[PDB]
Amino acid sequence: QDRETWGKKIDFLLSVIGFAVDLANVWRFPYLCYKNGGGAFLVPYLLFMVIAGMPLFYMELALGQFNREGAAGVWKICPILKGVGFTVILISLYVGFFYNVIIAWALHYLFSSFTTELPWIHCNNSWNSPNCSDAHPNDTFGTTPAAEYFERGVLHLHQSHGIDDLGPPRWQLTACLVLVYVLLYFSLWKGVKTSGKVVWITATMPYVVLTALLLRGVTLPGAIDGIRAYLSVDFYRLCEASVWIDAATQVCFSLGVGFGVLIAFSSYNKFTNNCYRDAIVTTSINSLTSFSSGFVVFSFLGYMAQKHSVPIGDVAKDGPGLIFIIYPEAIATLPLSSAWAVVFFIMLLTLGIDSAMGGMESVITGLIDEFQLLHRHRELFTLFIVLATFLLSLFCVTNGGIYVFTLLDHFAAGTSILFGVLIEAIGVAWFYGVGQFSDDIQQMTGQRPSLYWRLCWKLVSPCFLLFVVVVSIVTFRPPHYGAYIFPDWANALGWVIATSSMAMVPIYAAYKFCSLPGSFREKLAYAIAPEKDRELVDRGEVRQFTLRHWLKV
Numbered sequence: 001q002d003r004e005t006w007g008k009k010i011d012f013l014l015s016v017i018g019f020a021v022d023l024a025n026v027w028r029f030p031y032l033c034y035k036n037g038g039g040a041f042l043v044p045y046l047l048f049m050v051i052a053g054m055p056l057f058y059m060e061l062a063l064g065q066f067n068r069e070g071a072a073g074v075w076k077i078c079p080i081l082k083g084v085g086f087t088v089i090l091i092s093l094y095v096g097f098f099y100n101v102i103i104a105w106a107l108h109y110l111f112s113s114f115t116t117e118l119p120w121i122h123c124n125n126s127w128n129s130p131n132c133s134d135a136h137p138n139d140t141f142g143t144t145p146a147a148e149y150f151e152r153g154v155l156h157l158h159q160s161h162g163i164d165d166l167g168p169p170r171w172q173l174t175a176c177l178v179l180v181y182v183l184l185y186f187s188l189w190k191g192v193k194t195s196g197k198v199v200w201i202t203a204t205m206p207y208v209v210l211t212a213l214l215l216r217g218v219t220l221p222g223a224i225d226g227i228r229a230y231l232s233v234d235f236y237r238l239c240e241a242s243v244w245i246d247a248a249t250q251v252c253f254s255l256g257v258g259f260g261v262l263i264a265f266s267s268y269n270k271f272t273n274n275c276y277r278d279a280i281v282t283t284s285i286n287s288l289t290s291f292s293s294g295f296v297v298f299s300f301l302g303y304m305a306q307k308h309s310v311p312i313g314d315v316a317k318d319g320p321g322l323i324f325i326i327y328p329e330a331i332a333t334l335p336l337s338s339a340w341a342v343v344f345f346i347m348l349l350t351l352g353i354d355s356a357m358g359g360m361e362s363v364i365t366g367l368i369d370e371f372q373l374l375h376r377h378r379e380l381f382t383l384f385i386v387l388a389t390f391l392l393s394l395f396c397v398t399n400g401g402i403y404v405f406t407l408l409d410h411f412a413a414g415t416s417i418l419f420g421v422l423i424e425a426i427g428v429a430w431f432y433g434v435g436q437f438s439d440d441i442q443q444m445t446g447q448r449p450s451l452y453w454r455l456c457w458k459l460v461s462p463c464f465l466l467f468v469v470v471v472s473i474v475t476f477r478p479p480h481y482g483a484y485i486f487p488d489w490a491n492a493l494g495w496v497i498a499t500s501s502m503a504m505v506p507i508y509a510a511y512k513f514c515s516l517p518g519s520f521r522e523k524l525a526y527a528i529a530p531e532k533d534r535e536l537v538d539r540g541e542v543r544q545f546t547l548r549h550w551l552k553v
C-alpha cells in the first residue's frame with residue numbers, strides 16, 4: 001500500500017502549530033524581552049527571523065513533502081549525509097526522557113486541586129520544615145508554603161543528597177507517568193488518522209485558557225506595572241553584544257527545527273500542497289502566541305511583585321519548578337481559586353502533551369520508514385518505543401529526580417540541535433544544489449522561489465548557524481540547581497551523550513564510504529551524488545565534481 005495522507009489540511013496545520021507552541025514558547029521570548037531591551041528586542045529578533053528563521057522552516061517543510069520519506073529516508077539526495085536523520089532521531093529520543101516527567105508533574109498537580117483547601121495555602125502540615133515564613137509587608141520566594149510544598153510534599157527532594165542518592169521511585173509520580181504514557185500510546189498507535197484528530201482539542205484549549213487568564217489577570221492590582229516592565233523601549237540596549245546572541249539563540253531554539261518533526265509531519269502531505277503558505281501561517285501564529293502569552297504571564301508577575309512588596313526583578317527568574325511556585329500562590333488568593341487552578345493545570349497538560357506526541361511521532365515515523373520489516377506492524381513498534389521511553393524515564397521520578405531532569409535538559413538538545421541543523425542545511429544547499437531544490441519546489445507547487453530564498457538558503461543561513469554553534473560552545477556553563485554543584489563525572493556523562501547524539505554523521509559517512517564498491521573516485525561519486533542521478537553517474541557525468549555546480553547560486 002502507498003503512503004497515507006492527512007485527512008484534512010487543518011489536521012496538519014494544527015499538528016505543527018501544537019508541536020511548535022510549547023511551555024517554553026510561553027516564557028522564553030517574554031523573559032528575554034524583559035531581561036535585555038523590551039520594545040527594542042523586537043529588532044534583532046525580527047531581523048534574525050527574516051534572515052534565517054523562515055528559510056529553515058520552509059526548507060524542512062519542502063524537503064519532507066517532496067521526498068515523501070521520514071527524517072532518515074529523506075536523504076536519498078545525498079547518501080553520504082544520511083547520519084543527520086539518525087542524529088535528529090536520537091535528539092528526539094533523548095528529549096523524551098524528561099518532557100514526560102514534566103507532564104506527569106503537571107497532571108499530579110491537577111489531581112490535587114478538586115478540593116476546597118488547596119494544599120499550598122498555609123504551612124501547618126507534615127511535609128513542611130520549621131523554616132516557613134511567608135511575609136507580606138535573601139531569597140524572598142524560598143521557603144514559601146508553595147515552594148516548600150512543591151519541594152517536599154510532591155518531589156520529596158529533601159530526602160536526597162544529590163545525583164548519587166536517587167533512591168526508589170515514588171508510586172504517585174509513577175502512576176501519573178503511566179497515565180501519561182497510556183494517553184500517548186493510544187493517541188499515536190493508529191497511524192496519523194487518529195493522531196491528527198486528537199490534536200483538534202489539545203491545540204485549541206490552551207488559547208481559551210490563556211484568554212480567560214488574560215481577562216482575569218489584567219484586573220489585578222499591579223498588573224499594568226508588570227505589562228509596562230515587559231514592554232518598555234530602550235534602544236541603548238542594542239549596543240551590547242549579548243542581546244544579539246540571546247536573540248539568535250532564541251530564534252534557533254524556538255522554531256522547532258532539528259528534531260526531524262517537520263519533515264515527518266509534512267511527509268504525509270499531498271504532493272501538490274502549498275508549503276510556502278503553510279510555513280508563513282505557522283511561523284506567524286507561533287510568533288504571536290508568544291506575545292499574547294507574555295502579556296498574560298507578566299500581568300501575573302506584576303501582581304505577585306506588588307503583593308510581595310519586592311521589585312519585579314526578583315519575581316521574574318528562570319528555573320525549574322518556579323512555574324509550580326509563583327502562579328499557584330497567585331491563584332490561591334483569587335476567589336473561586338479551585339477552578340482557576342484546574343484550568344491552569346489543564347492548559348499546562350495540553351501544552352506538554354501535544355509537543356510530546358509530536359516528538360514521539362517523529363521517531364516512530366523515521367524508524368518505520370527506514371526499515372521495511374516494521375511497516376506491517378505499527379502498533380507493536382509504537383508499544384515498544386513507548387515502553388522503552390517509559391522505562392528510561394523512571395529515573396526522573398525518584399527522590400533526586402530533579403537533578404537528573406536538570407542534567408538532561410541542559411545536555412540533551414544543546415549544541416547538538418544546532419550542529420544537526422547546520423549539517424542538514426549545508427548538505428541540502430550545497431551537495432544537492434539550491435538550483436535543484438528550487439526546481440523540485442517549482443515542480444511540487446507551481447511557482448519557483450525567488451532570489452531571496454536561494455540566497456538565504458545558500459549563503460546567510462550556514463554562516464548564521466555556524467556563528468550560533470561557536471557562540472554556544474564557547475560560553476558553555478555547567479548546570480546547577482540552587483546551591484548544588486554537579487559532580488565532574490555528571491558533566492562528563494552529559495558531554496558524552498551530547499557528542500554521541502552528534503557523532504553519528506562521521507560514523508555513517510565512514511561506513512557508507514567503506515561499503516561502496518570501486519576505487520576512490522567511484523566510491524566518492526556513488527556517495528555524494530543523488531539517487532536519481534544514478535544513470536548520469538554511471539556514464540561518468542557527476543555534477544558535484546565540476547566546480548561550476550559548487551559556485552552556482
Ligand SMILES: CC(C)CCC[C@@H](C)[C@H]1CC[C@H]2[C@@H]3CC=C4C[C@@H](OC(=O)CCC(=O)O)CC[C@]4(C)[C@H]3CC[C@]12C
Nearest residue numbers: 008009010013014017203204205207208211278281285
Ligand atoms: C476561543 C477564542 C478566544 C480562542 C480560539 C483560538 C483557536 C480556536 C484559534 C486561534 C488562532 C486560530 C488559527 C488562525 C489561522 C488559521 C489559518 C486558517 O486558514 C488556513 O490555513 C486554511 C486551511 C484550509 O484550507 O483548511 C486555518 C485555521 C487556523 C490554523 C486557525 C485555527 C484556530 C485557531 C488556532
Ligand SMILES: CC(C)CCC[C@@H](C)[C@H]1CC[C@H]2[C@@H]3CC=C4C[C@@H](OC(=O)CCC(=O)O)CC[C@]4(C)[C@H]3CC[C@]12C
Nearest residue numbers: 094097163164165166167168392395404407408493497
Ligand atoms: C540518556 C539515557 C541513557 C538516560 C541517562 C540517565 C542517567 C542520568 C542515569 C542512568 C544511569 C544512572 C546511574 C545508575 C546507577 C547509580 C547508582 C545509584 O546508587 C545508589 O546510591 C542508589 C541505589 C538504590 O537505588 O538503592 C546512585 C545513582 C546512579 C549513579 C545513577 C545516576 C543517574 C544515571 C547516570
Ligand SMILES: CC(C)CCC[C@@H](C)[C@H]1CC[C@H]2[C@@H]3CC=C4C[C@@H](OC(=O)CCC(=O)O)CC[C@]4(C)[C@H]3CC[C@]12C
Nearest residue numbers: 182183184185186187188189190194195198201202353
Ligand atoms: C485523548 C487521547 C490523548 C487519548 C484517548 C483517545 C481514544 C479515546 C481514541 C483515540 C484512538 C481511538 C480508536 C481509533 C480506532 C479505532 C478502531 C475502530 O474500528 C474500526 O471500525 C476500524 C478498525 C477495525 O476494523 O478494527 C473502532 C474505534 C477505535 C478503537 C477508536 C476508539 C477511540 C480511541 C481509542
Ligand SMILES: CC(C)CCC[C@@H](C)[C@H]1CC[C@H]2[C@@H]3CC=C4C[C@@H](OC(=O)CCC(=O)O)CC[C@]4(C)[C@H]3CC[C@]12C
Nearest residue numbers: 042045046049050054280283284285287288291450452
Ligand atoms: C513579533 C510579532 C509581533 C510578529 C512576528 C511575525 C513574523 C515572524 C512574520 C509575520 C509576517 C512574516 C513575513 C510575511 C512575508 C514575507 C515576505 C517574504 O518575501 C518575499 O516574498 C519577497 C520579498 C522581497 O523581494 O524582499 C519573506 C518572508 C516574509 C518577510 C515573512 C517573514 C516572517 C514574518 C515577518
Ligand SMILES: CNc1nc(C#Cc2ccc(Cl)s2)nc2c1ncn2[C@H]1[C@H](O)[C@H](O)[C@]2(C(=O)OC)C[C@H]12
Nearest residue numbers: 023024026027213296297317318319320321322323
Ligand atoms: C517565573 N518562572 C517561570 N515561569 C514560567 C511560566 C509561565 C506561565 C505560562 C502561562 C502563564 Cl499564565 S504563567 N515558565 C518558566 C519559568 N522558569 C522557567 N520556565 C520554563 C522554562 O522554559 C523551563 O525550560 C521550563 C521547565 O523546566 O519547566 C519544568 C518549561 C519552564
Ligand SMILES: COC(=O)[C@H]1[C@@H](c2ccc(F)cc2)C[C@@H]2CC[C@H]1N2C
Nearest residue numbers: 020022024095096099256355356359
Ligand atoms: C526541549 O525541546 C523542546 O521543548 C522542543 C520541542 C520538543 C521536541 C521533542 C519533544 F519530545 C518534546 C518537545 C517542543 C518545542 C518546539 C522546539 C522545542 N520546544 C520549544
Ligand SMILES: CCCCCCCCCCCCCCC
Nearest residue numbers: 178181182185379383386387390
Ligand atoms: C506504559 C505503557 C502502556 C502502553 C499501552 C497499554 C495497552 C497496550 C495495548 C496493545 C495492543 C496491541 C495491538 C494488537 C496486537
Ligand SMILES: *[C@@H]1O[C@H](CO)[C@@H](O)[C@H](O)[C@H]1NC(C)=O
Nearest residue numbers: 129130131132138139142143
Ligand atoms: C531553615 O531552617 C532549617 C532548620 O531545620 C535549616 O536546616 C535551613 O538551613 C534553614 N534555611 C534557611 C534558608 O535559613
Ligand SMILES: CCCCCCCCCCCC
Nearest residue numbers: 113114115116338339342343
Ligand atoms: C468536589 C469539589 C469541586 C471543586 C471545584 C471544581 C470545579 C471544576 C469545574 C470547573 C472547571 C471546568
Ligand SMILES: CCCCCCCCCCCC
Nearest residue numbers: 178179181182183186189379
Ligand atoms: C488504561 C486502559 C487500558 C485498556 C487496554 C485495552 C486494549 C484494547 C486493545 C484492542 C485491540 C483490538
Ligand SMILES: CCCCCCCCCCCC
Nearest residue numbers: 179180182183184185186187
Ligand atoms: C485513558 C485512555 C483510555 C483508552 C481506551 C481505549 C479502548 C479501546 C477499545 C476498542 C474496542 C474496539
Ligand SMILES: CCCCCCCCCCCC
Nearest residue numbers: 208209211212213215216219
Ligand atoms: C472563554 C470564556 C472567558 C470567560 C472569562 C471570565 C474571566 C473572569 C472575569 C472576571 C471579571 C471581574
Ligand SMILES: CCCCCCCCCCCC
Nearest residue numbers: 207281284285286288289292
Ligand atoms: C493568537 C494568535 C493569532 C494569530 C492570527 C494569525 C492569522 C493569520 C491568517 C493568515 C491568512 C492568510
Ligand SMILES: CCCCCCCCCCCC
Nearest residue numbers: 208209212335336339340343
Ligand atoms: C471554559 C472555562 C474557562 C474557565 C472558567 C473559570 C470559571 C470563571 C467563573 C467566573 C468567576 C468570577
Ligand SMILES: CCCCCCCCCC
Nearest residue numbers: 168169170171174175394
Ligand atoms: C517501594 C515501592 C516501589 C514501587 C515502584 C513502582 C513500580 C515499578 C514497576 C516497573
Ligand SMILES: CCCCCCCCCC
Nearest residue numbers: 171172173174175176178
Ligand atoms: C502502595 C499502595 C499503592 C500501590 C500502587 C501500585 C500501582 C502504582 C502505579 C503502577
